[PDB]
């Protein structure tokens, strides 16, 4: 289903990485956030929904979505919670790539975004996740 995204936070070096994955394609978007908070989650959700057609979001930590702030962002953007192996393979893959480029950047946040870039452009055959998301979404638009 083209509008389903998974969102979770992971921890590395005392910092928090918010990782969103488009389930159908494996494409990822991520930000290094200063603290795991409802305000940061909500802002990221609003950003994501203005960039891709987000219809539902699933998470592996349901308590991440209970705050008034996050509920308001889902209300404004028209997102609903998705009620039920791709995601597991994309988050340890992301730490694996982060580990490989970590010494190429001074800051962790730079390495995270290098890892997103490598991830999304990797052809798996056999197109990349970035190629798959735009095909999926463009195909969905044309009826």
From Swiss-Prot:
Coiled coil: none annotated. Mg(2+) 3 binds at residues 8, 60, 88. Residues 1-137 form the Integrase catalytic domain. It is found in: Virion; Host nucleus; Host cytoplasm. The core domain contains the D-x(n)-D-x(35)-E motif, named for the phylogenetically conserved glutamic acid and aspartic acid residues and the invariant 35 amino acid spacing between the second and third acidic residues. Each acidic residue of the D,D(35)E motif is independently essential for the 3'-processing and strand transfer activities of purified integrase protein. Catalyzes viral DNA integration into the host chromosome, by performing a series of DNA cutting and joining reactions. This enzyme activity takes place after virion entry into a cell and reverse transcription of the RNA genome in dsDNA. The first step in the integration process is 3' processing. This step requires a complex comprising the viral genome, matrix protein, Vpr and integrase. This complex is called the pre-integration complex (PIC). The integrase protein removes 2 nucleotides from each 3' end of the viral DNA, leaving recessed CA OH's at the 3' ends. This is Integrase. It comes from Human immunodeficiency virus type 1 group M subtype B (isolate NY5) (HIV-1). The lineage of its organism: Viruses, Riboviria, Pararnavirae, Artverviricota, Revtraviricetes.
